[PDB]
């Protein structure tokens, strides 16, 4: 498909040193890209190393940093997991540097809490929701400032429980400053797609293609992202784009680690389909099944 998931220009030519469509059938000009083909010109294994990226219309926070126990965004923004998910699934609002009003920065807001505030603080007031709001919070979170505060808080208290609760928060706050990891990199904005060769589309004996599960996951994320771009073109009302961004959030969260959210999606028939984290973890991931133990030539039985 030009240009779909399994593109030509974005990745490479199926055949080795061939424009899939039609030009270069010898070994002279390896690289030329005509307008009739919109195709690169390299090796058959070149697509296995090349990866694509999906421009997610609406920001979506990572599931590995939101539900890892303890969550990476749970002990960093000083907010309970329950409240973090509420806002993340378009079910709660979050304040962000309101101004001269009677409201905190971490404190959340509900429909009734926002409605009344909307008519009250109609001017200088900011109260978003979802990953966008979360991203802002993380983005506008002076790491260094928190360190001293946390450090001073730990030296000005005697509470055993608090001490352990403060030492676990300051440990992940100073470790982030030691490296080049930003707080706004937790939310996924430019979702990456695994190489086609690594998500292979081979037909079994017959005339149909036995498709992998990751192609279902990526194809749903792209279907939803196209729908969300079209609705933000058309200026749909608030509840439509909240459901649309929420379905995109759940689609991305299902692509990365399926089933960590409520009941896992399924294609055929009731069995859930296998995601990227389920290509890593488990007895049948890459470590325990292809890197620690391998199948071996020059062997017999």
């Amino acid at each position: 498909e030009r240009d779909g998931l399994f593109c030509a220009r974005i990745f490479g030519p199926v055949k080795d040193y061939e424009c899939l469509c039609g030009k270069y059938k010898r070994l002279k000009h390896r690289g030329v890209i005509c307008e009739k083909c919109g195709v690169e010109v390299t090796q058959t294994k070149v697509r296995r190393e090349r990866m694509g990226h999906i421009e997610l219309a609406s920001p979506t926070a990572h599931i590995w940093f939101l539900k890892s126990l303890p969550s990476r965004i749970g002990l960093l923004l000083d907010m309970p997991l329950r409240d973090i998910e509420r806002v993340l699934y378009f079910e709660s609002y979050v304040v962000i540097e309101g101004g001269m009003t009677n409201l905190e920065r971490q404190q959340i807001l509900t429909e009734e809490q926002y409605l009344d505030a909307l008519e009250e603080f109609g001017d200088e007031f900011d109260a978003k929701m979802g990953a966008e709001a979360i991203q802002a919070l993380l983005k506008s979170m002076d790491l260094e400032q928190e360190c001293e505060q946390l450090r001073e808080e730990l030296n000005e208290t005697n509470s055993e429980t608090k001490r352990k609760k403060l030492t676990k928060r300051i440990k992940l706050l100073e470790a982030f400053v030691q490296s080049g990891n930003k707080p706004e990199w937790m939310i996924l904005t430019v979702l990456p797609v695994l190489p086609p060769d690594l998500r292979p589309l081979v037909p079994l004996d017959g005339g149909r293609f036995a498709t992998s599960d990751l192609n279902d996951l990526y194809r749903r994320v792209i279907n939803r992202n196209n729908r969300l771009k079209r609705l933000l073109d058309l200026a749909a009302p608030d509840i439509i784009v909240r459901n649309e961004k929420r379905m995109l959030q759940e689609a991305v969260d299902a692509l990365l680690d399926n089933g960590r959210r409520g009941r896992a999606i399924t294609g055929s028939n009731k069995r859930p389909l296998k995601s990227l984290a389920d290509m890593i973890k488990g007895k049948q991931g890459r470590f325990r099944q292809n890197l620690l133990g391998k199948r071996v030539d020059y062997s017999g039985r």
């Binding site: 030009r2 307008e35 009739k36 429909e111 729908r227 079209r230 609705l231 058309l234 200026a235 749909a236 009302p237 608030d238 509840i239 439509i240 909240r242 459901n243």
Partner: protein, 161 residues
């Protein structure tokens, strides 16, 4: 006064959901509690949502969710689900066809030299269009897909930018 609400159906069975909804209204004869049922259509937004003129009693809420192939309302909460707006209805009344208007009675997709033909006999490939007859709705795409490389009078809708 009847205000609007948004219903989610199984996307694809939407006309059958609308018909079954009208029939459940005329079965349980709460005729004074329902005004219309909208599925708008362009020459189809919205992709899977049914608009209902309604009032909010819990009986009518159970009625709409007891209509088959309906998931539920979409709002702030499930106790008191949310109507949409009214200030954006005045601007929508003046314009109800922004994705198919006569504002640009010519170019539907930038011709230039990057288009693909799929409608009609010739299909699936692509060519470079030098001149174009927008007035008479004609294109001179020298698509080299079907044949050598001659300009084949194609239709704007038949081709794709």
């Amino acid at each position: 006064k009847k205000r609007w609400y948004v219903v989610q159906a199984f996307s694809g069975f939407e006309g059958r959901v609308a018909t079954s909804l009208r029939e459940h209204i005329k079965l349980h004869n709460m005729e004074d509690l329902f005004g219309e049922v909208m599925v708008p259509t362009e020459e189809k937004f919205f992709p899977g949502y049914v608009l209902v003129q309604m009032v909010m009693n819990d009986a009518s809420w159970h009625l709409v969710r007891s209509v088959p192939r309906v998931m539920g309302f979409i709002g702030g909460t499930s106790d008191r689900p949310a109507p949409i707006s009214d200030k954006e209805v005045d601007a929508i009344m003046n314009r109800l066809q922004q994705v198919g208007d006569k504002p640009r009675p010519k170019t539907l997709f930038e011709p230039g030299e990057m288009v693909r033909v799929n409608d009609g006999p010739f299909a699936d490939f692509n060519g470079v269009v030098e001149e174009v007859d927008y007035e008479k709705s004609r294109l001179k795409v020298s698509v080299s897909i079907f044949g050598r490389a001659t300009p084949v009078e194609l239709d704007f809708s038949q081709v794709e930018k």
